[PDB]
Ligand binder design. Structure first.
Ligand SMILES: O=C(O)c1cc2c(-c3cccc4ccccc34)cccc2[nH]1
Ligand SMILES: O=C(O)c1cc2c(-c3cccc4ccccc34)cccc2[nH]1
Lengths: 343, 343
């Protein structure tokens, strides 16, 4: 795929990002110790993932911009804006792992769990966020899209933070309540906390870099991308349990962690008073036996079949969304992304 | 003073800020619960202080802009940018109180310590930061200084975060070391963590709003304001101990909290090997007797006299800085601020 083609150049560019960001202690030797800590924070948190969100900027750039205008400088800017997306995610992950007491992230121990780090990781998360705007100034200050990119990264941080607030209010640690776990609530959490920054932001960033700044074009691209975001998170909640972890790189911690998953939401909708009481008793419990009972209840309520009928309607619908709203953008912009998610 | 004159109108404008920020759930009823939490976060954290940093924007605006151009709309923008400074501080305080395990802030319990809040306050701090850029867009999008304000608020967040990193590395909780407590380190911490956002940011924001965007003018104003910032923090560290808390609104928690204070720094400089060992044994201890021994050592080393000779040299020096670097700005811009700090 077009993602694997662009990966190597993109991952190689991280060294440049780190160099340019650590080139602040040249004239200001006084902050050197802080800059060394910033480097360590970048290396641990911005590296070790799939880089899919960041690569989406680069892939979309290649497809939106005329090959003739894709010079050395424009590509460097595309790889930087791609890394800004990856930094925005690192900032979210570092902080979210603190708030939900996570132990591991991308196979390794969470940054905040590292000895000597702890709650200092809050400042580290803030620094990761600050790096975006430093990189945008260093690389894009002179571009006609500079302001659009700044506003886009700010609006996406804001939407994600609203999504995170909504998530925290729905699943309060200690105040365990399944009444709050509605489809309307789930869809809003997914839209604000995940779909905007993961799907709309990288394509939207690529669009502005190509000079596509029209509100209607951005509204059209957003209608497609937000639906792709809903599907992705719904599919990810299934794979957390009903998915053979050979393919993935994570296992079912959602039942024991008391998460507002798409599974628990459908389970509640299709529940009899007795079925609900079983879920009420077993969901969110650290006990192995209790986790095993929820899985059995999900299987009983046709949830692997419910997810298949959802996939079916979703495959056709995203194709309808691309058919109707991709123009004037090349449909391959959305299709290349949908292939990675839907297959 | 000119600060007390502008206070009432400024504090009354908070209601408008909260209304405009909570006017996002009109078209998006789905995020209503999150917006209610944002309102509660604003009301608890942005209110209850002296509002000095925010008022500095408004006072400086009144003195920099021609009375004829100070219309209804321009004043609303000045009060909003003043509130953006107050929000930037709320974001820093909420987060810093988490990182150093603070119990109280402005006489009341820290937000994170409130039952049901806890580490959710990290998201709350992030939301407070996001509100700045929302207010700048809502009020200043159409102004020729829009971008300058965005970049100024971003650069100030970055400088404060670097200052906070430097502070955390100097005073690691558990890894108690006085060797790190140097004057060069203290001055860098104060400059990055405090002086930029408290002194340079509000005047600089007022300057851009007046159309004063020149690099030399900003460099001149910064030379004055950074020295005012150094003095302020040095004076504040003294008042923490040697200052009768009748005047202030806080007491000596710096010795027991193991802080890199200007006092402990001078104490180390003027220490014999024996005097250092006493400090090494008693500094950073929760024990009342141990806290009492440090105070006695500071008194012995002429530290109230050392601070007076510092005040003397500082009074003349800031007057020299204003004399030399205020032009073309009215010197009252800096003088009105220095009066509040130096008297
Ligand atoms: O977050 C992960 O580890 C992950 C990412 C993906 C993606 C993916 C591929 C290409 C672009 C994307 C843009 C936004 C979100 C996800 C993608 C497809 C399948 C599984 C995944 N897991
Ligand atoms: O932070 C507090 O509570 C406080 C603020 C002040 C100020 C002050 C006054 C006017 C403008 C300022 C701008 C930046 C920093 C401090 C000021 C003068 C004395 C004591 C203070 N305590």
């Amino acid at each position: 795929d077009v993602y694997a083609q662009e990966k190597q150049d993109f991952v190689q560019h991280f060294s440049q990002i780190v160099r340019v960001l650590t080139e602040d202690e040249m004239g200001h030797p006084e902050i050197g110790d802080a800059i060394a800590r910033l480097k360590e924070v970048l290396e641990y948190n911005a590296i070790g993932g799939k880089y899919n969100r960041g690569l989406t900027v680069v892939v979309a750039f290649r497809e939106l911009v005329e090959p003739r205008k894709q010079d050395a400088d424009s590509l460097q800017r595309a790889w930087t804006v791609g890394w800004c997306v990856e930094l925005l995610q690192a900032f979210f992950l570092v902080a979210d792992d603190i708030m939900d007491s996570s132990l591991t992230r991308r196979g390794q121990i969470c940054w905040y769990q590292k000895p000597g780090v702890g709650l200092d990781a809050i400042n580290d998360a803030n620094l990761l966020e600050a790096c975006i705007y430093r990189l945008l100034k260093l690389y894009c200050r002179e571009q006609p899209y500079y302001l659009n990119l700044i506003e886009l990264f700010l609006q996406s941080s804001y939407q994600t933070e609203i999504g995170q607030t909504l998530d925290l209010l729905t699943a309060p640690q200690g105040n365990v309540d399944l009444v709050r776990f509605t489809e309307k609530r789930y869809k809003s959490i997914v839209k604000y906390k995940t779909a905007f920054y993961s799907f709309y932001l990288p394509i939207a960033a690529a669009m502005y870099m190509a000079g596509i700044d029209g509100e209607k074009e951005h509204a059209n691209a957003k209608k497609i991308l937000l639906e792709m975001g809903e599907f992705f998170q719904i599919q990810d909640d299934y794979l957390d349990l009903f998915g053979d972890p050979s393919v993935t790189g994570k296992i079912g911690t959602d039942i024991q962690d008391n998460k507002c998953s798409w599974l628990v939401v459908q389970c509640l909708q299709r529940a009899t008073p007795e079925q609900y009481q079983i879920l009420k008793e077993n969901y969110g419990q650290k006990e192995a036996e209790k986790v095993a009972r929820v899985k059995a209840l999900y299987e009983e309520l046709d949830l692997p079949a419910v997810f298949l009928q959802y996939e079916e309607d979703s495959y056709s619908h995203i194709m309808a969304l691309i058919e109707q709203y991709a123009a004037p953008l090349p449909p391959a912009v959305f299709l290349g992304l949908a292939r990675k998610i839907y297959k």
